[PDB]
């Protein structure tokens, strides 16, 4: 299976613009959720776990669909929460029917990561949306529960490299943990709705001890009231994860230009794009326009 990206009929850099600048103005309008951390938390992780479904092996998955909008996708307990995300993207779809799927889910995600301050993601228009039979299933997403042979072996099914998966894992930064949602409660760390390379910091600063949650999972906590799950701990755990780990911490700016990167193609797996498609779209965020 090819998935040619097909640019949605007539629309250019201007109509995706203005679909990143009503989320944005969202994001910053519904700013209650989720005790004052806002939805740039749960849509950057909408677009990543539409994304993440992907095999390499098969092209089966991937964000080009849009199959989070099927029951089987948005019933998975993998995706406990993201409905929130869902919810928040529906009046938007609303405003602009023209988007498929696949391309809001994954603009929702650039448009957080960049009103959060971090990194210009460049974005590409042209997934389709699919039918309910191309919806993969439940079971594509990672535990948390793991160590670091557990995290390397699972990116390599996403084409992504070492590098690639500490960068990624960045993003823990943002948001936190909810016991009843995943079994594992709190936020990473202090800068949760700001994109920073905090996560990379507290790895290395905090001091971790290992506990039990109340639903009888361990995670590791600091006294400054943050946690790590166990796949995050393996970051450090693993040297050669350790290693990139360290670099992070100590170069804002590297991070941010390898999450970019890490980020677009993760949204990008599977996606053919024509020699003749547009390039790239670098949003500019409200900011930047004065909105
Ligand atoms: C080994 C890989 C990963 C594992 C096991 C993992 C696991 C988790 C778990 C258990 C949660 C908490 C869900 C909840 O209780 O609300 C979470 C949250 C989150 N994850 Fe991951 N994650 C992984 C990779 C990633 C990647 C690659 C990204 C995106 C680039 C990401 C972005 C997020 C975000 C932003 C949140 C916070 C959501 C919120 O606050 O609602 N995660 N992750």
């Not at 998935?3 to 009503?22: C, I, L, P, T, W």
């Not at 849509?43 to 099927?70: I, M, P, Q």
């Amino acid at each position: 299976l090819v998935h040619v990206a097909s640019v949605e009929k007539g629309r250019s850099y201007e109509d995706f613009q203005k679909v990143y600048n009503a989320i944005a103005l969202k994001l910053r309008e519904d700013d209650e959720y989720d005790n004052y951390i806002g939805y740039g938390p749960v849509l950057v992780r909408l677009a990543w776990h539409t994304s993440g479904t992907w095999d390499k092996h098969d092209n089966t998955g991937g964000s080009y669909g849009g199959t989070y909008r099927f029951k089987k996708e948005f019933n998975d307990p993998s995706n406990a929460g993201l409905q929130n995300g869902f919810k928040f993207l529906e009046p938007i779809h609303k405003e602009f029917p023209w988007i498929s799927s696949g391309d809001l889910f994954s603009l929702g995600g650039v448009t957080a990561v960049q009103e959060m301050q971090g990194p210009k993601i460049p974005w590409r228009c042209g997934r389709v949306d699919t039918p309910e039979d191309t919806t993969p299933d439940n079971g594509r997403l990672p535990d948390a529960d793991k160590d670091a042979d557990y995290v390397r072996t699972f990116f390599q099914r996403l084409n992504m490299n070492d590098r690639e998966v500490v960068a990624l894992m960045g993003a823990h930064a943002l948001g936190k943990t909810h016991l009843k949602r995943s079994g594992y409660e709190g936020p990473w760390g202090a800068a949760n709705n700001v994109f920073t390379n905090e996560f990379y910091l507290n790895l290395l600063n905090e001091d971790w001890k290992l506990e039990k949650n109340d639903a009888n999972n361990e995670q590791w906590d600091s006294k400054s009231g943050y946690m790590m799950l166990p796949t995050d701990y393996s970051l450090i755990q693993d040297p050669k994860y350790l290693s990139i780990v360290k670099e992070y911490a100590n170069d804002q700016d590297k991070f941010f230009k390898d999450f970019s990167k890490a980020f677009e193609k993760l949204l990008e797996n599977g996606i053919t794009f024509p020699k003749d498609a547009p390039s790239p779209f670098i949003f500019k965020t409200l900011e930047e326009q004065g909105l």
